Design a protein around this nucleic acid. Structure first.
Ligand SMILES: [Mg+2]
Ligand SMILES: [Mg+2]
Ligand SMILES: [Mg+2]
Ligand SMILES: [Mg+2]
Ligand SMILES: [Mg+2]
Ligand SMILES: [Mg+2]
Ligand SMILES: [Mg+2]
Ligand SMILES: [Mg+2]
Ligand SMILES: [Mg+2]
Ligand SMILES: [Mg+2]
Ligand SMILES: [Mg+2]
Ligand SMILES: [Mg+2]
Ligand SMILES: [Mg+2]
Ligand SMILES: [Mg+2]
Ligand SMILES: [Mg+2]
Ligand SMILES: [Mg+2]
Ligand SMILES: [Mg+2]
Ligand SMILES: [Mg+2]
Ligand SMILES: [Mg+2]
Ligand SMILES: [Mg+2]
Ligand SMILES: [Mg+2]
Ligand SMILES: [Mg+2]
Ligand SMILES: [Mg+2]
Ligand SMILES: [Mg+2]
Ligand SMILES: [Mg+2]
Ligand SMILES: [Mg+2]
Ligand SMILES: [Mg+2]
Ligand SMILES: [Mg+2]
Ligand SMILES: [Mg+2]
Ligand SMILES: [Mg+2]
Ligand SMILES: [Mg+2]
Lengths: 72, 49, 71, 123, 175
RNA sequence: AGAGUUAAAUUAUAACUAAGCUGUAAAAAGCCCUAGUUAAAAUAAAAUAACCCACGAAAGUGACUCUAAUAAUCCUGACACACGAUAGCUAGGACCCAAACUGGGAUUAGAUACCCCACUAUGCCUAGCCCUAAACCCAAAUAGUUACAUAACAAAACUA
């Protein structure tokens, strides 16, 4: 009966958790790896604007904070 | 009607002086609430002493 | 029903236990059962009435409830 | 009457008793209370033995104080009662006579519930 | 803040005959002094509906309900001050602040002048519901902040580059 | 949601008394700073009433008392707003009892389990998060009707 659907899920979940334990630190890399792409693409997004709006420098008092890498 | 009830009880209240009376009276006359029931709905209050 | 007359509340309590009889014993309306129950609990915490036995004074009083213990 | 004060007091002789009650109602009349009445319910042996102020008591005197007081106050009086050395247990209840009697018209008899299960010609 | 004075004689006793001759004890018993809070809220209700309204009698009046609701809100706010952890009552308050806004939108559509005067009296302000409810998140708030400042700059630069042209062409026209 | 309170039970810790006490299908290990009795705070959890069916939007809520208190003259409505069992995370307290983990003991071919014994994170409070459930009554909201009508089963069928 419908348990037979749940069994599949139950297994697929278990078999996933196990995986994410072994793979943990590999995972941890690739997460942060993409956060450093994010923050960069983000930056370029704004850089694009100065250069598109004709300004040479980034406007006064702009440090362009890091949102994605926010921790603690 | 309410206001007049309270007007009536205002004579019977305990005030700073009557403490000396009231307290001395409270000890003199113990009162019971103890109260019972009968299967017919009737009450039997405490037996006469 | 007042929490003050412990005799009354004693009438609805099991003598040996200190139990509170259910409707199916006491035979009361809903509101009167509830009333009695709350009243009792009050009488217990304030300590006009004890918890684990029916006060002996009141064992000899009229019995309301339908229980037969001794056969 | 608005509030009700159940005083269980250490059983003493008469003078000491009088003192205790007097100062109690003084405290109340100071927090803003109007005292209606004082009902001595006697000295009884307590239903069970009560431990307060490092004394374990068997008997006690019983008192009932009806009074009107402002909402804000009740805490204050409770505190000053708990502090007291001869109160063997305090309490304050909304006076029973504010609560209404809504007439039990009687038992409204409950009929058996029907149309729970579908009509099925089973077996 | 308003203050329904301690002696104010609870509402239901206000208009009955022969009150002021009565001795100070009973007056003290029927005062706001010995009252529940509900009573004080009946008073606040009365006073507010007198100051603000037109016809004290109409309950169904859109105005009336706005005033009443506002009284209860003001109460939930104090109850909010004293209990900050109470989620239930926070819910009530925030539903109610809203419903009041609903009926205010009704007044603003239907009877304008009246709506206006109520907003004046009760200190309620009507902020039109802004289109597009979108959760502003860090990335967006930041990118907008930047853009806003880029604008604020390019109009400055345009201003100066045209200002030196104004100065040059005027200094050539003068001599 | 606050603030105050405790009846039963349990535990420290003393006074006696006996050597055992605990524990299972049967045992073992375990403890004799143990056990029975008599005293007794804290902490935690709330017999009976309940054969009741109330209160909350839902989660949830049933020891006692007082304070505050339960939106809308009441239609539907989100990716917006505010909440959201357990477990979990952060800091500080608490610690009777329970208890993942773990260490003993049995059982077993094996036994990383079911049974036994200890003991921990943790359940508890205050403040902040996390936002998941067989979060299910698997039955959307608001007005209706019992006409028409049986796929099956289950809680009977349908309009707008
Ligand atoms: Mg699979
Ligand atoms: Mg990736
Ligand atoms: Mg059938
Ligand atoms: Mg708290
Ligand atoms: Mg105890
Ligand atoms: Mg013991
Ligand atoms: Mg012990
Ligand atoms: Mg056995
Ligand atoms: Mg051995
Ligand atoms: Mg039960
Ligand atoms: Mg239930
Ligand atoms: Mg209220
Ligand atoms: Mg409602
Ligand atoms: Mg709606
Ligand atoms: Mg949660
Ligand atoms: Mg937790
Ligand atoms: Mg622990
Ligand atoms: Mg301890
Ligand atoms: Mg343990
Ligand atoms: Mg093992
Ligand atoms: Mg085998
Ligand atoms: Mg087995
Ligand atoms: Mg331990
Ligand atoms: Mg909890
Ligand atoms: Mg559930
Ligand atoms: Mg279910
Ligand atoms: Mg679902
Ligand atoms: Mg819906
Ligand atoms: Mg609704
Ligand atoms: Mg029809
Ligand atoms: Mg068939």
């Amino acid at each position: 009966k419908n348990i037979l659907k749940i069994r599949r899920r139950k297994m697929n979940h278990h078999k996933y958790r196990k995986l994410v334990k072994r793979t943990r630190f590999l995972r941890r890399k690739v997460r942060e790896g993409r956060l450093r792409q994010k923050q960069v693409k983000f930056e370029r997004d704004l850089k694009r604007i100065w250069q598109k709006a004709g300004l040479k420098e980034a406007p006064a008092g702009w440090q362009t904070p890091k949102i994605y890498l926010k921790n603690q | 009607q309410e206001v007049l009830q309270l007007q009536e009880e205002a004579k019977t209240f305990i005030t700073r002086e009557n403490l000396e009376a009231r307290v001395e009276e409270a000890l003199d006359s113990p009162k019971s609430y103890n109260w019972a029931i009968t299967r017919e709905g009737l009450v039997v209050r405490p037996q006469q002493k | 029903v007042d929490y003050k007359n412990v005799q009354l509340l004693s009438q609805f309590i099991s003598p040996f236990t200190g139990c509170i009889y259910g409707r199916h014993i006491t035979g009361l309306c809903g509101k009167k059962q509830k009333e009695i129950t709350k009243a009792i609990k009050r009488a217990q915490i304030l300590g006009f009435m004890p918890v684990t036995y029916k006060d002996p004074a009141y064992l000899k009083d009229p019995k309301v409830c339908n229980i037969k213990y001794r056969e | 009457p608005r509030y009700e004060l159940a005083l269980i007091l250490k059983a003493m002789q008469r003078p000491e008793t009088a003192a205790a009650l007097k100062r109690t109602l003084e405290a109340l009349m100071d927090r803003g209370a109007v005292v209606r009445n004082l009902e001595n319910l006697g000295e009884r042996m307590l239903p069970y033995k009560i431990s307060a102020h490092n004394q374990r008591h068997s008997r006690g005197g019983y008192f009932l104080v009806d009074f009107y007081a402002p909402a804000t106050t009740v805490e204050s009086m409770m505190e000053h009662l708990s502090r007291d050395i001869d109160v063997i247990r305090p309490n304050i209840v909304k006076h029973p006579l504010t609560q209404e009697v809504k007439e039990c018209e009687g038992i409204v008899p409950v009929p058996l519930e029907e149309k729970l299960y579908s009509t099925k010609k089973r077996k | 803040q308003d203050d329904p004075p301690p002696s104010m004689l609870l509402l239901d006793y206000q208009n009955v005959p022969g009150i002021h001759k009565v001795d100070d004890v009973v007056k003290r018993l029927l005062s706001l002094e010995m009252a529940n809070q509900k009573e004080k809220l009946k008073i606040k209700k009365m006073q507010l509906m007198n100051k603000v309204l037109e016809n004290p009698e109409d309950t169904s009046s859109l105005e009336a309900r706005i005033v009443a609701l506002t009284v209860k809100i003001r109460n939930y706010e104090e109850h909010m001050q004293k209990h900050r952890k109470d989620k239930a009552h926070k819910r009530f308050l925030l539903m109610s602040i809203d419903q009041r806004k609903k009926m205010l939108k009704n007044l603003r559509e239907t009877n304008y002048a009246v709506f206006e005067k109520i907003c004046k009296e009760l200190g309620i302000e009507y902020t039109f519901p802004p289109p597009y409810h979108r959760k502003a998140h860090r990335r967006w708030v930041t990118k907008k902040a930047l853009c806003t400042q880029v604008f604020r700059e390019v109009q400055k630069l345009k201003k100066q580059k045209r200002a030196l042209r104004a100065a040059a062409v005027a200094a050539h026209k003068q001599g």
